Amino acid sequence: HMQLRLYNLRVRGLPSDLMGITDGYVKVFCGSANLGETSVNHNNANPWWTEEFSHFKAQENDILRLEVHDEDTFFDDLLGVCQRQIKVGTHEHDCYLKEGGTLHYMYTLSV
Ligand SMILES: [Ca+2]
Ligand SMILES: [Ca+2]
Ligand SMILES: [Ca+2]
């Protein structure tokens, strides 16, 4: 087992919602294990989140998948997906979201 820690999620420049400012949250997977989701950062085009995510059964080269969604009343909209293979150490990354904006994040993979 290796330990993965995913943290410092933030987005710059989310697009408009159908009505007003987007209500973003991030869902986190590692090797298709569901690691959970952040709270919704309501009415914020440039959110950052305090939440962090750990996975104590990771392996090097597992695929980290980050999904940025907009919360809505009837159907949430998936704005973008960032995927990469995890490497030992601490790494900072950014990702351009299909529907607009850029996601920045860090992770640490250990032991
Ligand atoms: Ca929407
Ligand atoms: Ca809103
Ligand atoms: Ca919304």
- 3-state SS record for the chain: CEEEEEEEEEEECCCCECCECCCEEEEEEECCEEEEECCCECCCCCCECCCCEEEEEECCCCEEEEEEEECCCCCCEEEEEEEEECCCEEEEEEEECCCCCEEEEEEEEEC
Query: For 68-71, which contacts have Cβ atoms below 8 Å and span 24 or more sequence positions?
Result: 68/11, 68/24, 68/25, 68/26, 68/97, 68/101, 68/103, 69/24, 69/25, 69/26, 69/27, 70/14, 70/17, 70/22, 70/23, 70/24, 71/23, 71/24, 71/25, 71/40, 71/42
Task: Note the ligand closest to the C-alpha atom of 72.
Answer: 3
Tokens at 90, concatenated: 């601490």
Asked if residues 83 and 67 have their Cβ atoms less than 8 Å apart, the reply is no
- Delimit the domains of the chain by residue range: 1-111
52 is in an annotated binding site: no
Q: What is the CA(68)–ligand 2 centre distance, in A?
A: 15
Q: Report the candidate in 29, 32, 37, 19 with the shortest Cα–Cα distance to residue 73.
A: 19
94 is in an annotated binding site: no
- Mention every residue, 6+ apart, whose C-beta is less than 8 A from residue 51: 9, 38, 39
CATH pick for 1-111 out of 3.40.50.2000, 2.60.40.150, 3.30.70.360, 3.40.50.150: 2.60.40.150
Q: What is the CA(69)–ligand 2 centre distance, in A?
A: 12
Neighbours of ion ligand 3 (CB under 5 A): 17, 23, 70, 72
Which residue do the tokens 């209500």 mark?
A: 23
Resolution in A: 1.7
